[PDB]
From a paper:
Pentameric ligand-gated ion channels (pLGICs) mediate synaptic transmission and are sensitive to their lipid environment. We demonstrate that the model pLGIC, [name] (Erwinia ligand-gated ion channel), is positively modulated by the anionic phospholipid, phosphatidylglycerol, from the outer leaflet of the membrane. To investigate the mechanism of positive modulation by [name], we determined structures of WT [name] by single particle cryo-electron microscopy (cryo-EM) in the absence and presence of agonist in MSP1E3D1 nanodiscs with 2:1:1 [name]:[name]:[name] (hereafter referred to as 2:1:1) or [name]. In combination with streamlined alchemical free energy perturbation calculations and functional measurements in asymmetric liposomes, the data support a mechanism by which an anionic phospholipid stabilizes the activated, open-channel state of a pLGIC by specific, state-dependent binding to this site.
Seeking a mutant that remains open in the presence of agonist, we added the mutations P254G (previously shown to slow deactivation) and C300S (previously shown to slow desensitization in the presence of agonist), and produced P254G/C300S/V261Y/G319F/I320F ([name]). Strikingly, [name] showed a deactivation rate ~1000× slower than WT and no evidence of desensitization in the presence of 10 mM cysteamine, indicative of profound stabilization of the activated, open-channel state. Consistent with its gain-of-function phenotype, a structure of [name] in 2:1:1 nanodiscs with 10 mM cysteamine, determined at 3.4 Å resolution, yielded an apparent open pore with a pronounced outer leaflet phospholipid-shaped density. Finally, in [name], 9′ rotates away from the pore into an intersubunit space and 16′ opens further, such that the narrowest diameter of the pore is at 2′ (Q233). Two rotameric states of Q233 could be modeled in the structure yielding a minimum pore diameter of 5.6 Å (rotamer 1, [name] CA 1) and 7.3 Å (rotamer 2, [name] CA 2). [name] has the same single channel conductance as WT; this along with its high open probability strongly suggests that the [name] structure represents a functionally-relevant open-channel conformation. The [name] CA structure shows a strong phospholipid density at an outer leaflet site within an intersubunit groove formed by M4, M3 and M1. The β6-β7 loop progressively translates outward from WT apo to WT CA to [name] CA, placing the basic residue, R117, less than 4 Å from the phospholipid headgroup in the [name] CA structure. The outward translation of these structures is linked to a global outward blooming of 4–5 Å of all four transmembrane helices leading to opening of the pore. In the TMD, the outward blooming of the TM helices in the [name] CA structure extends to the bottom of the transmembrane helices, and is associated with an outward translation of 4.7 Å and straightening of M4 below P305, a conserved proline that produces a kink in the M4 helix in non-conducting structures of [name].
Author numbering:
A (entry chain B), B (entry chain C), C (entry chain D), D (entry chain E), E (entry chain A): 11 to 321
The structure:
Amino acid sequence: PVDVSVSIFINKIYGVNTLEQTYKVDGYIVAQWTGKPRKTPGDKPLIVENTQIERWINNGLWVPALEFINVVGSPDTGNKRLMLFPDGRVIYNARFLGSFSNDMDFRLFPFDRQQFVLELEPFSYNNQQLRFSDIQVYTENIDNEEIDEWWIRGKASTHISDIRYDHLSSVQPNQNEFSRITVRIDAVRNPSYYLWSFILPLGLIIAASWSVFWLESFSERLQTSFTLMLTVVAYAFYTSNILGRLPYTTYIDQMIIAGYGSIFAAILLIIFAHHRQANGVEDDLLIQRSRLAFPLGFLAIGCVLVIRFFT
Amino acid sequence: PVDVSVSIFINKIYGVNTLEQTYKVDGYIVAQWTGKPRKTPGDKPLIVENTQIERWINNGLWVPALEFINVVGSPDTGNKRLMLFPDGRVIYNARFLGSFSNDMDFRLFPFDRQQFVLELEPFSYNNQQLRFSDIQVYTENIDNEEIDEWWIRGKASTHISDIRYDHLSSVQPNQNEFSRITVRIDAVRNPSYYLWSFILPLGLIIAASWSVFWLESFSERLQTSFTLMLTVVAYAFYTSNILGRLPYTTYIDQMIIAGYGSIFAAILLIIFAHHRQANGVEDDLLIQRSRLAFPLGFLAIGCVLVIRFFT
Amino acid sequence: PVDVSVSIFINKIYGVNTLEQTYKVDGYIVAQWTGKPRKTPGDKPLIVENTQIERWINNGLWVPALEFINVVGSPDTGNKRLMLFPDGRVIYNARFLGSFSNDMDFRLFPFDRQQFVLELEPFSYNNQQLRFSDIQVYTENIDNEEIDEWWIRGKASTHISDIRYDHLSSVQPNQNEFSRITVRIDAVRNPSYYLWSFILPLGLIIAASWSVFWLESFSERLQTSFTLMLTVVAYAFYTSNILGRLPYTTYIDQMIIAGYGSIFAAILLIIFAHHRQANGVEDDLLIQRSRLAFPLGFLAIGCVLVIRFFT
Amino acid sequence: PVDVSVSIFINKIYGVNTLEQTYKVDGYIVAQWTGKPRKTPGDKPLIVENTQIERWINNGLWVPALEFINVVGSPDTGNKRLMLFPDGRVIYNARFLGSFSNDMDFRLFPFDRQQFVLELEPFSYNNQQLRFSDIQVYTENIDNEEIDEWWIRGKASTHISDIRYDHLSSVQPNQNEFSRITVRIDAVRNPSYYLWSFILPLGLIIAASWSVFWLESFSERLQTSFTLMLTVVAYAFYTSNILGRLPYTTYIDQMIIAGYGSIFAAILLIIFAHHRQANGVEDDLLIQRSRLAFPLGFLAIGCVLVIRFFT
Amino acid sequence: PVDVSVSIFINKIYGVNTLEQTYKVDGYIVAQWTGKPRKTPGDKPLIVENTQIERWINNGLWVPALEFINVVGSPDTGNKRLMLFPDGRVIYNARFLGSFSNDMDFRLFPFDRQQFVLELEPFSYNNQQLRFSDIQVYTENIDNEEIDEWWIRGKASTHISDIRYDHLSSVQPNQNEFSRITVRIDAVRNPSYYLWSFILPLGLIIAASWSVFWLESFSERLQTSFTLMLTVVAYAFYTSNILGRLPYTTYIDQMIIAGYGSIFAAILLIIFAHHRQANGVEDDLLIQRSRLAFPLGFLAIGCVLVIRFFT
Ligand SMILES: CCCCCCCC/C=C/CCCCCCCC(=O)O[C@H](COC(=O)CCCCCCCCCCCCCCC)COP(=O)(O)OC[C@@H](O)CO
Ligand SMILES: CCCCCCCC/C=C/CCCCCCCC(=O)O[C@H](COC(=O)CCCCCCCCCCCCCCC)COP(=O)(O)OC[C@@H](O)CO
Ligand SMILES: CCCCCCCC/C=C/CCCCCCCC(=O)O[C@H](COC(=O)CCCCCCCCCCCCCCC)COP(=O)(O)OC[C@@H](O)CO
Ligand SMILES: CCCCCCCC/C=C/CCCCCCCC(=O)O[C@H](COC(=O)CCCCCCCCCCCCCCC)COP(=O)(O)OC[C@@H](O)CO
Ligand SMILES: CCCCCCCC/C=C/CCCCCCCC(=O)O[C@H](COC(=O)CCCCCCCCCCCCCCC)COP(=O)(O)OC[C@@H](O)CO
């Protein structure tokens, strides 16, 4: 095979769409291999711009078609240069811009760790004809940087693996294993916006529904409760606008469901108290003092939900 | 005719849009046929990358144009390679990315079974000039995998049929029947998100409107009812944001309409009771005990709606 | 001129967008004419695929550029084949995919009849140089089929007309009249979704506001009314999300305005009754019995609004 | 220079987007000039379709690149024909489809006059090398026609001006002035949809808040007021969905702000009356009769807001 | 190296999207350098239009590929001309249309200063082979002009820097430093729309919740408060529709959170007063006079929030 050394420079990561779990990566790819020696005007390396690589390929020069595996749509290719050397080494540099997809797990939604994956692979040549010798990813432009709500933590881990393709087994009998480069850039979500923007109003709503226990009249303890209940219920599709329609519950929507149960338990408790308060004064010392025992219960539920993340 | 053996490798299925009933399928297609023997540099199969297939077709090599029938828009074609053999067999491999449409039935919306269909057909040649000998679809990448809310269950059933085209009957008198490959991938919807996200809040709303019967004062039994009624009524267009504007009712919207009827029957019953309660105490033993008979009625209605699916 | 016989096969009609009154039509177009006799390899008709029609046109073969007049954007052209005969007849088949616009009238919105129009015309040649001899549209794939909410009723009426172009009068002095093919496919909207999804909740709301007359206390007859009034008022922009911002009123929004007037007349009537009820018991036998005369008035208004459609 | 006579046929104007103040114009452009005489097959004018104009330009024929100045994105060019004459005149006809931008003023939003502007200019040649002799715009297809909510009033005024470009002053020392054609099509907005859809519900809301003065109990005069106030306040972003986030106030949003002030003044007046009604019956003859003086004040405010438009 | 003198004419800046912090810039770029002298027809500079620059590059003419660094997507290139001189200077003019991204800081959202940045750089040649001699940006078309809500203040500051690329260090050992042009156009946001559209309704809401202290009955002082609280709480995602999901708080959302705290403190204060008002008249002179001390507290909080911007 031929040894192709790749350098991926990530200019920027933007447009991290969690609805379809895609992220737009812009950058440059530099694939360098060695071939037969050639003659150039002078002895400098010859630069062939875009549109002219086709003329050199029609002349007979071997240029591999490296593709992105985890891309959504076709990648936008900007300029591409082909830099040839007198000693015989060929360099193919190209600006890629692609919507790449990765399987993202949102079970811890505000406090979230994901990774952006770039999968690069020869389209035609298996590792018996093209082997990726090494890759260094030069992600210094976004190495420690918040893009929209994602901090980029750590370095980009680079792996070179080999993927067996069963669909090419009939057309290539015993050589269908393709060299592949995987670039992982770990990202940690910034939970600050959800903290001041959704956790805080829902916290004031839940605290206000704690406060409706401290009232004396039944005309205000049930109507308010119902207004606060339906206000929490209206927040059901908050994460489905940010994330997809996920089968699991995040932390935000579990807090919303805890709000459902809290206001519903409050409503049922107060309705039961007024129903047993029919045939007289009918006042017990326990229910009137349950105004302070209910926020403690919600705090215990919140703590036992956090403690799973804490361990 | 010539025997074209197809292999479709499905890399991923994503973007399953139920608004227009489309789904984006990315993959590779490998069509293999045999022609006259040819000479190549050495005796290895010769790989012709993209942009160079046109030169070989202008030279005179026969490459069929296989198209996708059920596609929305034009399919994005990534790289395409053409691998020629000394013994004469030609292989056309191409990365397709297409928005494909299938007729989807959403009469059982959360608990839903659909299928993703790929229809592949020669654009020009009928089965007297090009016959699909066989197809194997290598869908191992998504064989048992949840993509967004769809589990992929079972294998991809592959069929080769022949479609008669009446519009080509005048231009091709007695040979207008085209070979076609249909690939069906069955998918089952994950109902979990609708269970914790819409079934649960609507269940608490309906249970709270059961609970308003247990009140004593008329100032709270009608106002609450109306707030809960309009809260359920505001959920009318929930499925039309997920599905289209379907002429039939799903299970979610039938539950919403059952909510309409339940709160409306509650409101009418309580209004009638207070209207017949004009000229005295006017209390009957039946209406005051109908607080427990109404959730049983709603549970019976829910059970008889489920039992149609159960059989 | 030359006689060009067209066959339009409509594969599917999808994406019927009533916001900008466009609809996406996918299909095949087969234009057949006769020229000078030619020689082909063997005596079979020669099939020239895409990309190779340009070589034959550069050789000197006459291929007209047929365009779509009522298209939005540029039409997506898939594969195109050019099938030449030894006896001299030329066939140009091409897969078109276009967003076509038609002037749609939504004055009867749920109960709506529209038509999808395909306008096809030579771009360069007037009817002195290219005449459309006949067209048959093979719309058997969608002949009796509901696509999203449109039933396709009847056959596709095909017309061949001639359009005079005044802008080409200076460059072509007395021959600027172009042959044109118009294909009309009549469609009838399915009103079922609006019936169970918007007509039903608004009907229960209007019936509940009929029911608030049956109350006795003023604290409930005005507040409820106002809640139901603002609930109906919030439905003003329901059709503007489905249709455009139309200058006329449909049936849905006239029902919404009838709701406005009904709840407002109820509110004004009850406020006037309580204002004249100041200086005593002040009870008249007419207003207390107007609880049953108001739904009859709304039913009469609905009937006289329907009877215009009935005639 | 050479005299280029332009004819712009506007097929349709559609997609008038007031969010970014763009409008999609579809049409044909016919630019006619005269060159050296040439020989054609026979003596008829020779029609060169798309794809073949490039061959004639490579042969050496002068075809100018006319561009659109006020376009958003790149214009979609459909077919283009090049019609050459034996006497030497060259005609370039091309179907353009472009999103064009014009500076739109929405200070009178429902009752609005705008104009759609097409700016056409040679890309390379200044007026010393290419002068636009005349233009006639053949806008008979939309001459008196409502497209979405815009009536096209009057004819399309056509102007030929000359624009000096300072950026080309260094590369072209004393000849950087380019001929330009501006086509203005005046349009008047249809206010009907806003009249029956937003003016009417807001009018009933404001009239209902006039009607809450006629009540006797304080428990209904403040709560209702607040519900109607927040209903009007929820309509703040109505125009920002139709127009942009404009720095000025239209007529709709000034009516909304007048609603704000009216309900707020009502709320403050009633709260002040009940606060001064503390130490007794405390009833004055003026405030109880201000129920009729407040709608007169709002009508005077509306009239003095209209009278600026009236003059 | 060769000295390339650039002139960027900004036709318009439009589509300033603050969700992904991009802005669409349309304009012309004129890059002028000097090469070997050449012969042209006559002695005028020869203009080579689009499509023909490729023929001259294949002939052997050196045309650099200048790219935009901060672009989102691939830039739309309209017409491009190549104007050659007999004395040897080459001019490449091209209409660019690009979505450019800049890091925007929205910590002062209505009262906001940003800058639109155009970064231009040779794709292939480092500053040892191509140096940008100077740039003048001719932004007279938008020099003092409001586009959507941005005033363009000042001139466009132009800088020529040199960027070292580590990813090109292996392929170019000691010459990987590329010349770059950065064009900054400062823009100041127009806060007027947020002033009359969001600041004003929220101000009336906060003033109305000041006014609910002036009431006497507890049935109106808590329910109203809760309605106004939830009305303010519903405005949490106002800026996330305009800006992104920013980790920091702007001025609008800090005003919203101040609204949260104000209504919540009002609700808690009134609930505490009624809870301590259990065992008698229980009236203190301080709480009843706190109706006027609470808006002063909110004004002090607003002033101390403004005074950070004031310094
Ligand atoms: C003791 C101290 C005071 C406490 C009193 C108030 C407390 C009331 C608690 C409410 C629930 C608390 C749990 C909060 C978080 C719950 C959120 C949660 O865990 O998930 C949902 C559970 O379903 C649920 O909750 C459903 C549970 C019902 C929620 C409504 C509760 C109201 C109960 C009526 C009141 C009782 C009256 C007493 C009657 C005697 C469903 O996720 P899902 O399916 O995707 O799983 C699959 C996925 O996890 C992996 O694929
Ligand atoms: C007995 C125990 C207690 C029960 C008391 C409360 C129970 C009240 C029941 C309400 C309805 C229950 C059904 C729930 C599911 C109903 C949903 C449903 O089946 O579909 C809709 C039916 O229309 C409908 O419902 C319309 C039915 C009306 C809904 C409102 C009901 C309020 C009735 C006023 C109160 C009565 C007062 C008593 C007066 C004497 C329309 O689908 P569509 O057209 O697409 O078909 C075509 C498609 O199926 C195939 O193409
Ligand atoms: C008698 C039995 C009981 C009845 C009592 C309740 C009944 C109250 C009726 C309300 C209106 C009924 C009509 C319903 C349908 C009305 C809908 C309608 O026809 O259209 C709108 C009419 O404007 C309108 O309605 C505006 C009419 C006003 C609507 C509000 C009515 C409340 C009246 C205050 C209460 C009266 C108190 C009595 C005071 C003495 C405007 O379309 P537009 O411009 O595009 O035309 C152009 C286009 O048609 C062709 O280009
Ligand atoms: C006398 C008869 C009865 C009347 C009693 C009720 C009447 C109450 C009137 C309310 C306002 C009426 C004006 C209605 C239209 C106002 C709309 C308007 O003119 O624009 C806004 C004005 O700001 C405004 O209004 C702000 C004004 C405040 C609005 C709220 C008013 C409530 C006042 C509290 C009650 C008073 C209690 C009495 C206390 C002693 C801001 O546009 P903007 O910046 O883009 O300009 C730049 C742009 O114009 C050019 O670039
Ligand atoms: C004295 C005169 C009368 C006053 C009485 C009423 C006044 C009540 C004040 C409310 C808060 C006032 C602050 C208003 C602006 C606050 C907005 C703000 O500063 O930001 C948020 C602060 O969190 C917050 O506020 C959270 C604070 C809580 C908000 C709710 C307050 C209700 C308190 C319950 C009532 C007390 C009862 C008394 C009990 C004894 C979070 O930004 P974030 O994270 O992105 O930072 C990172 C970023 O800044 C840089 O990356």
